[PDB]
Coordinates of C-alpha atoms and ligand atoms in Angstrom, one line a residue:
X1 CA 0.0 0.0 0.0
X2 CA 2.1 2.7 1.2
X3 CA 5.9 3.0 1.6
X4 CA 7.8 4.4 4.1
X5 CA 9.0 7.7 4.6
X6 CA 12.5 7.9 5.5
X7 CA 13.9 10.7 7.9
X8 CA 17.3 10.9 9.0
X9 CA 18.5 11.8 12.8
X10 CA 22.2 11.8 12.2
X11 CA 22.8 7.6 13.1
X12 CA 23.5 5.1 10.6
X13 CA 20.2 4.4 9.0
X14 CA 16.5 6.2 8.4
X15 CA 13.4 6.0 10.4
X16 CA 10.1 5.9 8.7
X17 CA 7.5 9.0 9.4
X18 CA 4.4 8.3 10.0
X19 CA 1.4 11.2 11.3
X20 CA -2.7 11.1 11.4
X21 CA -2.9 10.9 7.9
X22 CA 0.1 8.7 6.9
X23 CA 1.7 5.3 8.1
X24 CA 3.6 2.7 5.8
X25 CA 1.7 -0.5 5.9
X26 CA 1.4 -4.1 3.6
X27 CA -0.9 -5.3 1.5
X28 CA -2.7 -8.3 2.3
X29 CA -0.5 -11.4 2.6
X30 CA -0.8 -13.0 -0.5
X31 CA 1.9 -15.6 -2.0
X32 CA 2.7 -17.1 -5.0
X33 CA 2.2 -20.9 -6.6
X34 CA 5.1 -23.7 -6.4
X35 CA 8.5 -22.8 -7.7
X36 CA 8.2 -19.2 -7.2
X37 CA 9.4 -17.2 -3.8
X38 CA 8.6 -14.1 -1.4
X39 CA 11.9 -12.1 -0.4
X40 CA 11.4 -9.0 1.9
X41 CA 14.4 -7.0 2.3
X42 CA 15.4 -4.4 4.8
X43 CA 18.7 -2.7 4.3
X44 CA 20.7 -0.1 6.2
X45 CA 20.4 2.1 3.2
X46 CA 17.0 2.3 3.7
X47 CA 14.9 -0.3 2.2
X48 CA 11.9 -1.1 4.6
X49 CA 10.6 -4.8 4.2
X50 CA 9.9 -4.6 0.8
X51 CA 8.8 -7.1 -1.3
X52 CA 9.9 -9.3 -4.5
X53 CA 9.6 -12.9 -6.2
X54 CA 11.9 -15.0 -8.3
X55 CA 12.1 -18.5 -9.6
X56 CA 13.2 -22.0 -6.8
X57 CA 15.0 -23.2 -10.0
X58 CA 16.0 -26.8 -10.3
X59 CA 19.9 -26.0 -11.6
X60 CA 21.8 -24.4 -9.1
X61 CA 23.8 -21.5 -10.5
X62 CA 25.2 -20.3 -7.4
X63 CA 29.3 -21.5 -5.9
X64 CA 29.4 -20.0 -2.8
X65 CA 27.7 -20.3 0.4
X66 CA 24.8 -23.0 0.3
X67 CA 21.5 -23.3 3.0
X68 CA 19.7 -26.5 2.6
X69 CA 16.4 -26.9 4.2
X70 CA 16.0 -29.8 6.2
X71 CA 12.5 -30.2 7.0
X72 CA 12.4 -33.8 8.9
X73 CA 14.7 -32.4 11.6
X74 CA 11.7 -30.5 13.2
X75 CA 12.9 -28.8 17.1
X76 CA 10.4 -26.4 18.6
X77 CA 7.0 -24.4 17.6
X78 CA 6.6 -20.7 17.8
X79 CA 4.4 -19.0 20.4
X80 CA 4.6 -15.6 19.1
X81 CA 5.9 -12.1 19.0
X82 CA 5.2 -9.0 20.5
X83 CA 6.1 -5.9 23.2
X84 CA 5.0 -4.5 26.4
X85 CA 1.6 -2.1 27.4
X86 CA 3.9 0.1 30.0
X87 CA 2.5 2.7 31.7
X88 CA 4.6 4.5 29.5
X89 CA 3.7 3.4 26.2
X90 CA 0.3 4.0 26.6
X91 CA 0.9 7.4 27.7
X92 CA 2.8 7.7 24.8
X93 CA -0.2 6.5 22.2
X94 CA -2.9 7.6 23.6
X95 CA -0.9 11.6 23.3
X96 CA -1.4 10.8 19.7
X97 CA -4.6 11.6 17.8
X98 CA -6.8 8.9 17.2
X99 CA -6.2 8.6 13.6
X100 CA -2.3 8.3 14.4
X101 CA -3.2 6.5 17.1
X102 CA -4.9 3.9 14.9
X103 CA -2.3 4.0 12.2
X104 CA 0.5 3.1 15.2
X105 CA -1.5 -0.1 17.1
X106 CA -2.0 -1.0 13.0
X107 CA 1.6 -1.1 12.4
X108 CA 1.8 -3.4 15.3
X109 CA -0.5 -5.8 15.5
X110 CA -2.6 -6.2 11.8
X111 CA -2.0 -8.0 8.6
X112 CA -0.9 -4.5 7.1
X113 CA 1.6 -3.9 9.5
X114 CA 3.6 -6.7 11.7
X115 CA 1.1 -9.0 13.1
X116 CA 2.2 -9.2 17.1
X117 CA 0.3 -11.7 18.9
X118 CA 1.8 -11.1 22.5
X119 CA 1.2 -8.3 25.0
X120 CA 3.1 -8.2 28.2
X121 CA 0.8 -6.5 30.9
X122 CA 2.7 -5.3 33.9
X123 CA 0.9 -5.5 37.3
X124 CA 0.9 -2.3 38.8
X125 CA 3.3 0.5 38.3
X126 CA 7.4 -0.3 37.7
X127 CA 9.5 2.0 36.2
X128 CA 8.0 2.8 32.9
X129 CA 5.6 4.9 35.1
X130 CA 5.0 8.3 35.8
X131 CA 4.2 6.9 39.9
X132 CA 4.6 4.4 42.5
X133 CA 1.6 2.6 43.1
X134 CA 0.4 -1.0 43.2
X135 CA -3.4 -2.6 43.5
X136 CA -3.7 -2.6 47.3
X137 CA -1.7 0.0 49.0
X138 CA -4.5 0.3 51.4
X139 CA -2.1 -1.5 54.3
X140 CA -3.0 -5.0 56.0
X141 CA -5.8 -5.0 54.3
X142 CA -4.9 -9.1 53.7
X143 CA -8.1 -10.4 52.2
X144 CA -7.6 -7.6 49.5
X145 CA -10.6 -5.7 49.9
X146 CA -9.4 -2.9 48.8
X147 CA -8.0 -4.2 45.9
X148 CA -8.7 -2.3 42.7
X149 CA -7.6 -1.2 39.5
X150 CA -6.1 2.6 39.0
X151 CA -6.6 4.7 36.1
X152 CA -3.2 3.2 34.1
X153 CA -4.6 0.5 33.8
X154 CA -8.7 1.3 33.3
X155 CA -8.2 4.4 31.2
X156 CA -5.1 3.6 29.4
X157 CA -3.9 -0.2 29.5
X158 CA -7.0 -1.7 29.2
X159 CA -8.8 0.5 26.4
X160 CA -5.6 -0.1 24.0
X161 CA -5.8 -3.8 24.7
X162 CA -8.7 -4.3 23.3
X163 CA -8.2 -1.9 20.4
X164 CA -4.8 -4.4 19.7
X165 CA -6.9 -7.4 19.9
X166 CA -9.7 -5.7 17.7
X167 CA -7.3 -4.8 15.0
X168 CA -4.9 -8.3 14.8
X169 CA -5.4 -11.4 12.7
X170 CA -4.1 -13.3 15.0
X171 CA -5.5 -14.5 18.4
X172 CA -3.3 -12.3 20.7
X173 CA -2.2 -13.9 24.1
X174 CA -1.6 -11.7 26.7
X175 CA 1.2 -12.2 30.4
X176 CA 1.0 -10.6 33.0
X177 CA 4.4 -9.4 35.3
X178 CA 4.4 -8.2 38.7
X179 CA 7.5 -5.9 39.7
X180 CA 6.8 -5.2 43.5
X181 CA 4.0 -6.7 46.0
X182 CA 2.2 -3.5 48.7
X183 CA 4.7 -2.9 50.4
X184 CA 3.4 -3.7 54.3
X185 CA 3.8 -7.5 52.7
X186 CA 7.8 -6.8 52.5
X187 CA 10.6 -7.2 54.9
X188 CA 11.6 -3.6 53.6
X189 CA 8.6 -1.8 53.5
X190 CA 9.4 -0.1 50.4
X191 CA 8.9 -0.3 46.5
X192 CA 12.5 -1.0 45.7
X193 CA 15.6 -1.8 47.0
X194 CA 16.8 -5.1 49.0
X195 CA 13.2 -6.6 50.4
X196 CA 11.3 -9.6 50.3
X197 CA 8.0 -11.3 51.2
X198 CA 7.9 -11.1 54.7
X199 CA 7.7 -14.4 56.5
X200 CA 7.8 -17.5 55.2
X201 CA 5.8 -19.3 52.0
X202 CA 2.2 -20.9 53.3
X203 CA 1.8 -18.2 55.7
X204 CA -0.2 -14.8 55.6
X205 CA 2.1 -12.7 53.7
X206 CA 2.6 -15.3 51.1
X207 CA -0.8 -16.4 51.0
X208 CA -1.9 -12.6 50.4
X209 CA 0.6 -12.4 47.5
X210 CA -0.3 -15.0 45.7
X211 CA -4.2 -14.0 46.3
X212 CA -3.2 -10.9 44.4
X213 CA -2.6 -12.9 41.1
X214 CA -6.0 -13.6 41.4
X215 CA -7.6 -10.4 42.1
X216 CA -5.4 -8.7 39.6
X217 CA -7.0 -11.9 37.0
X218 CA -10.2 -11.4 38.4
X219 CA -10.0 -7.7 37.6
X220 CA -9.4 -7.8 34.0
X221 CA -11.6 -10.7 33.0
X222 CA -14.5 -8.3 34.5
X223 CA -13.2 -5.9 31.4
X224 CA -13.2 -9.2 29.3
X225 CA -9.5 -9.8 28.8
X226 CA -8.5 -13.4 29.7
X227 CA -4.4 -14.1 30.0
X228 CA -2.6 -17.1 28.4
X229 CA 0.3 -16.9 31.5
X230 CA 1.7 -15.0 34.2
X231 CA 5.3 -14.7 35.5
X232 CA 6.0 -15.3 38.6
X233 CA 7.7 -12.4 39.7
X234 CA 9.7 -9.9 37.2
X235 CA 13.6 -10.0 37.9
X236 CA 13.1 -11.8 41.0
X237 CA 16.9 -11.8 41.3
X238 CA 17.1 -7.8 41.2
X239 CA 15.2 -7.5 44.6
X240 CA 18.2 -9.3 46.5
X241 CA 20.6 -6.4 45.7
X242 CA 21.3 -3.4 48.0
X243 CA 19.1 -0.3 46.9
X244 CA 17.7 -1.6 43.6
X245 CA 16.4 1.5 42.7
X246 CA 12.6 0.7 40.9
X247 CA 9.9 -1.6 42.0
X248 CA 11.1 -5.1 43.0
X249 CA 10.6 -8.3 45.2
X250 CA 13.4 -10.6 45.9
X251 CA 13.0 -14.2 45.7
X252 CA 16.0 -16.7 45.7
X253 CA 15.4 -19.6 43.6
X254 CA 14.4 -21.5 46.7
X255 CA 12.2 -19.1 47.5
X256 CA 10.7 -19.0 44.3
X257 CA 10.3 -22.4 44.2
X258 CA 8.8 -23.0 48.1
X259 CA 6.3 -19.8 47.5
X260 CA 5.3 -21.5 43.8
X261 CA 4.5 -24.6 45.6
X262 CA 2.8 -23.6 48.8
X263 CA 1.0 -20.7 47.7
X264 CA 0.8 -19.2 43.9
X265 CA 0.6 -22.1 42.2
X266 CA -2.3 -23.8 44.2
X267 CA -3.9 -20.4 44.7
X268 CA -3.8 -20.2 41.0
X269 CA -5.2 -24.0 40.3
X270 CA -7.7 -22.8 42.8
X271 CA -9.3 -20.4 40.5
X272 CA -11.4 -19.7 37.8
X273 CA -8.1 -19.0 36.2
X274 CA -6.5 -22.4 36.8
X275 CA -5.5 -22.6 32.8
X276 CA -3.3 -19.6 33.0
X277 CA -0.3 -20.8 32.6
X278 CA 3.0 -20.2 35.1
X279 CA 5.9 -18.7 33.8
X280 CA 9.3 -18.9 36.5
X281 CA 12.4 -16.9 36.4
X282 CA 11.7 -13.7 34.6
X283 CA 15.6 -12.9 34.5
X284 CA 18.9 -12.7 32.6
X285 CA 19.6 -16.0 31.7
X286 CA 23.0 -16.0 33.6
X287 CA 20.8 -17.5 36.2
X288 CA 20.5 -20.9 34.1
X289 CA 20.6 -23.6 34.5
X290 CA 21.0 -23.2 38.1
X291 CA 17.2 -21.6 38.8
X292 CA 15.7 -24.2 36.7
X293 CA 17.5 -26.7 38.8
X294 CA 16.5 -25.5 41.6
X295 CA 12.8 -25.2 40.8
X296 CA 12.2 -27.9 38.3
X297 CA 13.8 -30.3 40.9
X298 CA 10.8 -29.9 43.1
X299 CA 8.2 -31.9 41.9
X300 CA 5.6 -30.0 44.4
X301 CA 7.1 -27.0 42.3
X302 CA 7.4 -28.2 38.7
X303 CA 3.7 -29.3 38.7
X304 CA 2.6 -25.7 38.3
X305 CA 5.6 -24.5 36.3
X306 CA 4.9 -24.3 32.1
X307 CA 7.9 -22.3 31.0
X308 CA 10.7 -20.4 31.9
X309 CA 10.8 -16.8 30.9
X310 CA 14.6 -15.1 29.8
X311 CA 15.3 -11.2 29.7
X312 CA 17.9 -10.8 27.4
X313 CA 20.1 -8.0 29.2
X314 CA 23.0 -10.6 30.4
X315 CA 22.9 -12.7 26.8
X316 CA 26.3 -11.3 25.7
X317 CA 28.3 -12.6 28.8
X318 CA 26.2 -15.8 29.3
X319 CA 26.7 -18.0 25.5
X320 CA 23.2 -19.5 24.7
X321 CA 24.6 -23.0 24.8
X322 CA 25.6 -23.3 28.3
X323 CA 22.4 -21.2 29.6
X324 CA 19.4 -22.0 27.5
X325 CA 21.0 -24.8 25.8
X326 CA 22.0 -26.5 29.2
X327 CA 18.7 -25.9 30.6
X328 CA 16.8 -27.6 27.5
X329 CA 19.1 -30.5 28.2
X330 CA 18.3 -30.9 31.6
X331 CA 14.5 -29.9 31.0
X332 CA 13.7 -30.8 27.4
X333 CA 9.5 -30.5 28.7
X334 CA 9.7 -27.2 29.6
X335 CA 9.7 -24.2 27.5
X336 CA 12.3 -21.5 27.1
X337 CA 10.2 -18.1 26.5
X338 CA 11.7 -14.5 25.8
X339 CA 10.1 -12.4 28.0
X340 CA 11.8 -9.1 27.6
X341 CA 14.3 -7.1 25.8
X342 CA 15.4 -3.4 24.9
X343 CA 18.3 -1.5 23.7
X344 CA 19.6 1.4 25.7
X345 CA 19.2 0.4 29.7
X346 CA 23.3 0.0 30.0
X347 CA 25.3 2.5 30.9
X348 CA 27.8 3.9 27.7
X349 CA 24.1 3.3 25.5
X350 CA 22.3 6.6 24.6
X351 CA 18.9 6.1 25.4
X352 CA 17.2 6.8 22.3
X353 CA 19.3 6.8 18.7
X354 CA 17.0 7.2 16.2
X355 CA 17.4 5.5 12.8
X356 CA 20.0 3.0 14.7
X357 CA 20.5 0.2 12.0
X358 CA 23.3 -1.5 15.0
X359 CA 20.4 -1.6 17.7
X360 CA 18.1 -3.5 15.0
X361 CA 20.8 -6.2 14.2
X362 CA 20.9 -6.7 17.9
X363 CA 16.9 -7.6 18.0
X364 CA 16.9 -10.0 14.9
X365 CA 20.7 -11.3 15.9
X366 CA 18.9 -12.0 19.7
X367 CA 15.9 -13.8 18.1
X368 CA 17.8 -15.6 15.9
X369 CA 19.8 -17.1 18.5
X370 CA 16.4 -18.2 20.9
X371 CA 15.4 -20.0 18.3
X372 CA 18.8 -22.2 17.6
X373 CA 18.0 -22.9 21.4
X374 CA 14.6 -23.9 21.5
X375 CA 13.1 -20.2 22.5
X376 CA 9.5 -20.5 21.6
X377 CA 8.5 -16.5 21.4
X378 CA 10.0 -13.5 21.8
X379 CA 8.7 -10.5 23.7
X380 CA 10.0 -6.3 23.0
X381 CA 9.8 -4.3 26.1
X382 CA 7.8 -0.7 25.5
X383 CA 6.0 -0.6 22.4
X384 CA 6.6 3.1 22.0
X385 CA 8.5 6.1 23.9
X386 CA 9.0 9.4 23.9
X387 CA 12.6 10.8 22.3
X388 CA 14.5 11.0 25.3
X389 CA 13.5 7.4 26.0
X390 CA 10.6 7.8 28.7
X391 CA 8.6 8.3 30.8
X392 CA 10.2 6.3 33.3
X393 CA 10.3 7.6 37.1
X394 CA 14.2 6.7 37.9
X395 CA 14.8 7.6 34.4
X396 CA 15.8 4.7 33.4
X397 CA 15.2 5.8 29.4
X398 CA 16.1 3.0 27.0
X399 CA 15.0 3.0 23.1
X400 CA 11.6 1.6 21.6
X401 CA 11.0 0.5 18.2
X402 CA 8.6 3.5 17.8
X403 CA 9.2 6.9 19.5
X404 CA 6.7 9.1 19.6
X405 CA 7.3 12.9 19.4
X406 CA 3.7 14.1 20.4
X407 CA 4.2 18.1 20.1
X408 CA 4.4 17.0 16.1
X409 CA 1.3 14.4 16.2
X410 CA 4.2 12.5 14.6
X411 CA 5.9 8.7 15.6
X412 CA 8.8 7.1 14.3
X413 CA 9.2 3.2 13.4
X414 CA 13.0 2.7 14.3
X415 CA 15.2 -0.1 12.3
X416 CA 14.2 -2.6 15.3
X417 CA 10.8 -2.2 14.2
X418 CA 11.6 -4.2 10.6
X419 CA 14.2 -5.9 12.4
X420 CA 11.8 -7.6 14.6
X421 CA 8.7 -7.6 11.9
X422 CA 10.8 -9.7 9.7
X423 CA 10.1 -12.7 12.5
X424 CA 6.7 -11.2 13.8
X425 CA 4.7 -11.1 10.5
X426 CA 6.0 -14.2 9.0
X427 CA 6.5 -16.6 11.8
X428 CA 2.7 -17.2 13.3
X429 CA 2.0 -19.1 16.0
X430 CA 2.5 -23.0 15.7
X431 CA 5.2 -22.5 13.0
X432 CA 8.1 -25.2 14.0
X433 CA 11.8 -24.5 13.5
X434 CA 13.4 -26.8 11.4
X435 CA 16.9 -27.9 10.4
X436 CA 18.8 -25.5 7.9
X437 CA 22.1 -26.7 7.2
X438 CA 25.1 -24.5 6.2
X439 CA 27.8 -25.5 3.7
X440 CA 30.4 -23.9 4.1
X441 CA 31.7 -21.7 7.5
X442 CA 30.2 -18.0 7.1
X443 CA 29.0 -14.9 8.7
X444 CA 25.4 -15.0 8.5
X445 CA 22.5 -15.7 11.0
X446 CA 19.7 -17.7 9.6
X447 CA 16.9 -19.9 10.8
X448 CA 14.4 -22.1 9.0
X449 CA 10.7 -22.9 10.1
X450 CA 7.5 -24.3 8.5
X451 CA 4.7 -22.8 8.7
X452 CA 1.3 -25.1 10.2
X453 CA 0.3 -25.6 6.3
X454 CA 3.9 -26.8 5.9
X455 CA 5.2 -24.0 3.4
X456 CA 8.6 -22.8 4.3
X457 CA 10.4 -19.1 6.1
X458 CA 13.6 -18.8 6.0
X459 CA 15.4 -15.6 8.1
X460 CA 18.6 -14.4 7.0
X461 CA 20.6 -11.7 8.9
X462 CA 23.7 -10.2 7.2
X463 CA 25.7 -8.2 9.9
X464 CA 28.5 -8.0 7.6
X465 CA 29.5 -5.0 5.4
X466 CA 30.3 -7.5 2.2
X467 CA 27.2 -8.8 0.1
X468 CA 27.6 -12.7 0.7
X469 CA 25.9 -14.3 -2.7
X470 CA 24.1 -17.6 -1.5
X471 CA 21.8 -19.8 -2.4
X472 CA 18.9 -22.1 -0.5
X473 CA 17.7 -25.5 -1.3
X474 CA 14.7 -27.1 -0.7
X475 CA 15.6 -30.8 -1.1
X476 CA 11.3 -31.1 -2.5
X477 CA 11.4 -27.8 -4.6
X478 CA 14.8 -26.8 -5.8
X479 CA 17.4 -24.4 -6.1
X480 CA 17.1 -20.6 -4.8
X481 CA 19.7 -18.0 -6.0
X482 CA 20.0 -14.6 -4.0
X483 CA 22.6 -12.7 -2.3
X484 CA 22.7 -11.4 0.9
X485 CA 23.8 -7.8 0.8
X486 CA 26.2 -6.3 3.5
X487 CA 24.0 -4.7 6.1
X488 CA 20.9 -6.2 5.5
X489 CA 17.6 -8.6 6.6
X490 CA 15.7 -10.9 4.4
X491 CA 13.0 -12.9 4.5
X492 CA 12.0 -15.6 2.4
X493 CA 8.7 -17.6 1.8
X494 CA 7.6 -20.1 -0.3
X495 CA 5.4 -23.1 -1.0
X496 CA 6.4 -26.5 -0.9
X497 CA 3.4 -28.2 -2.3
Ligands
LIG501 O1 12.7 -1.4 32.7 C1 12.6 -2.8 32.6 C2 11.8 -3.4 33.8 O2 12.0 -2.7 34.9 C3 12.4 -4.9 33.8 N1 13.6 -4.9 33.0 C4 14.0 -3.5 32.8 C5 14.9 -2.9 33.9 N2 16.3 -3.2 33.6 C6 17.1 -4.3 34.2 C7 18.3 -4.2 33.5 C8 19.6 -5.0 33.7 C9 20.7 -4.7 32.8 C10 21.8 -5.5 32.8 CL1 23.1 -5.1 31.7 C11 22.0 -6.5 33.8 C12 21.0 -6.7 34.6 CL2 21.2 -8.0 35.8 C13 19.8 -6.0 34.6 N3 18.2 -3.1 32.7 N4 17.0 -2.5 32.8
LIG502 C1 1.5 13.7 7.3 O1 2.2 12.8 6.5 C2 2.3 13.0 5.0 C3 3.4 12.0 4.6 O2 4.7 12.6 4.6 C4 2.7 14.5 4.6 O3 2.5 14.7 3.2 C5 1.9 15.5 5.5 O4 2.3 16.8 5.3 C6 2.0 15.1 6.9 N1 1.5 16.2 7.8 C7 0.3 16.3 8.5 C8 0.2 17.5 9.3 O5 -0.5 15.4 8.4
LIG503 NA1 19.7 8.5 11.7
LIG504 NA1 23.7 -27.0 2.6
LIG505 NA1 4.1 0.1 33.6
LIG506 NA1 -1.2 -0.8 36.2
LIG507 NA1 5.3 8.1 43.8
LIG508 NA1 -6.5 -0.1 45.8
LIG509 NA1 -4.5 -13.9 26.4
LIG510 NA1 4.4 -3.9 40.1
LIG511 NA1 1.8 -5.4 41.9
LIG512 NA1 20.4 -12.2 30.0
LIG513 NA1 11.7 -0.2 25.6
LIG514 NA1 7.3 -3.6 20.2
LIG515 NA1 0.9 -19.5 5.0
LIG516 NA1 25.7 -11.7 10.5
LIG517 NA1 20.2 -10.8 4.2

């Protein structure tokens, strides 16, 4: 339909423009017959997803690098894709006018735009809000009477929910986070820093806690929104450290796993919301294998466990293999989820570098790894922020896919917006990742999977300055000749029957 409008910021690549009157967007899917193939393209001199065919020939012209499909080595199946309804992000939308407004939760979540199916909900305030609050500050108040939902999430979280799930294709799951409890349940009593549950898990405190899960469900399904799966605690690890300085609540791993067992996950099973499913860890992976140990080991624990969910802020000093690898070894039954990621939370990071081809190649690099090790979704942070990275009330500003400058009605989609909707719109839920075999040593990322009608994506990062010629076969169709151009992102689709 329409293309995107490039605007440079002075960084190594173009955002695209969009206002109330104009966002780039697709087509409708539609793909060719057998022997013929989709390539989308993103490059760092500006092309935006865009779209061509060719011929899967039978001769194979190409010398150099080969990928060869190998479809009966079949490993994990996709959850989905998606980003986080902040406090901030939907402060950010909703300062848009409803047209823009529309044309930005379209480039997320519809057929014309990128097709997110996930939406992480935190629970109560954390950061990425403009105030401290939770659902029950009201103090010992431990049958949560007073429990109730504030304005964030009634006026802001809630309405743009639904106008995601009104918009998408897809069925759209939603997870819920906590980041801290009320804080007369905590040895601290305080929002952040060093504090725990107080007591021990079974009694009061932990009881109340784990009570809240249900309220907070309770709450939401009364404005008809149902969740596929919680987490049992965000960074859990991060509320053991000396004045952590935004909402937390410690748990070591055995604590995780005793208050899991003796209280969350039987409150949960409990409940009208018994399906729900349990998410542990909510963490940098540095903290595999050991936490799954530790948990999973516990069969009064594991019982109410589905996955394990992995923030991606520690992946660069903690190799996949020996983390998620190691734990998909030792637990091959439970699955590895992404749960969070952003660009611009370290210290020497900018917050916000707009048009930043490098922080795009680090979201499609990232996926691209999960999915060697058995990941089964990933999951963006803040949908959208503001240009110096926020609102966030320790000022913890990071980047966002889209920033929204709001004096000009006007939002930007950043290069980690294609870089992500290159797996998002292509990748539904239910795909499976299959084997794709290189031939030669090389400096490409790629992955294979099939879609649930069996036709074939293939992903293919180039992080490289040199154009890499290659060329993918499909042992059932044939032979397909491209290149890979120096600082770019394809896509590839085709039919196989
Ligand atoms: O704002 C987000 C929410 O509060 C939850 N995750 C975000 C907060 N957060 C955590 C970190 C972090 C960064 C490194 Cl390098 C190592 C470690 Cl252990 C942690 N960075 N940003
Ligand atoms: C909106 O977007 C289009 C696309 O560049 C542009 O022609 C128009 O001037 C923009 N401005 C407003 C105020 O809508
Ligand atoms: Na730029
Ligand atoms: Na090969
Ligand atoms: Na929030
Ligand atoms: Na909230
Ligand atoms: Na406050
Ligand atoms: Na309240
Ligand atoms: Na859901
Ligand atoms: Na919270
Ligand atoms: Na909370
Ligand atoms: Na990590
Ligand atoms: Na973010
Ligand atoms: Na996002
Ligand atoms: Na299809
Ligand atoms: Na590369
Ligand atoms: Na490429």
């Amino acid at each position: 339909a329409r293309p995107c409008i490039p605007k440079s910021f002075g960084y190594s690549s173009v955002v695209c423009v969009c206002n109330a009157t104009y966002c780039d967007s697709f087509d409708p899917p539609t793909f060719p017959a057998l022997g013929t193939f989709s390539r989308y393209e993103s490059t760092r001199s500006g092309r935006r997803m865009e779209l061509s065919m060719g011929p899967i020939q039978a001769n194979h012209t190409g010398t150099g690098l080969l990928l060869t499909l190998q479809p009966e080595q079949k490993f994990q199946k996709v959850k989905g894709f998606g980003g986080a309804m902040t406090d901030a992000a939907a402060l950010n939308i909703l300062a848009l006018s409803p047209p823009a407004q529309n044309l930005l939760l379209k480039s997320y979540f519809s057929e014309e735009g990128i097709g997110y199916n996930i939406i992480r909900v935190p629970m109560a305030s954390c950061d990425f809000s403009i105030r401290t609050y939770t659902y029950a500050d009201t103090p010992d108040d431990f049958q949560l009477h007073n429990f109730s939902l504030p304005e964030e999430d009634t006026k802001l979280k809630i309405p743009l929910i639904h106008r995601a799930l009104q918009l998408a294709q897809r069925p759209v799951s939603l997870l819920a986070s906590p980041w801290t409890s009320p804080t007369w349940l905590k040895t601290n009593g305080a929002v952040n820093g060093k504090g725990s549950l107080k007591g021990q898990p079974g009694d009061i405190y932990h009881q109340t806690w784990a009570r809240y899960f249900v309220k907070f469900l309770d709450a939401y399904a009364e404005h008809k929104l149902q969740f596929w799966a919680v987490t049992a605690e965000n960074e859990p690890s991060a509320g053991l450290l000396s004045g952590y300085p935004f909402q937390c609540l410690g748990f070591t791993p055995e604590h995780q796993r005793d208050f899991i067992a003796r209280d969350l996950g039987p409150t949960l099973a409990n409940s009208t919301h018994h399906n729900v499913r349990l998410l542990m860890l909510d963490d940098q992976r540095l903290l595999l294998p050991h936490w799954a140990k530790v948990v999973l080991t516990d069969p009064e624990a594991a019982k109410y466990v589905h996955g394990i969910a992995v923030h991606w802020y520690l992946d660069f000093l903690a190799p996949a293999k020996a983390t998620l690898g190691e734990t998909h070894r030792l637990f091959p039954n439970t699955m590895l989820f992404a749960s969070e990621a952003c660009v611009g939370s370290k210290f020497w990071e900018q917050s916000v570098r707009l048009g930043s081809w490098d922080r795009g190649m680090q979201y499609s690099h990232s996926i691209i790894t999960n999915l060697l090790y058995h990941v089964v979704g990933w999951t963006d942070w803040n949908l959208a922020l503001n240009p110096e990275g926020g609102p966030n009330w320790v000022r913890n500003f990071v980047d966002s896919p889209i920033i929204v400058d709001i004096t000009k009605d006007t939002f930007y989609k950043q290069p980690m917006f294609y870089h992500l909707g290159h797996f998002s719109k292509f990748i539904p839920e239910g795909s499976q990742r299959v084997g794709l075999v290189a031939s030669q040593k090389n400096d490409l990322d790629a992955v294979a999977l099939m879609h649930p009608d069996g036709s074939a994506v293939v992903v293919v990062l180039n992080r490289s300055s040199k154009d890499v010629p290659l060329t993918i076969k499909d042992p059932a169709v044939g032979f397909l000749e491209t290149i890979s151009p120096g600082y770019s992102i394809h896509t590839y689709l085709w039919h196989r029957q």
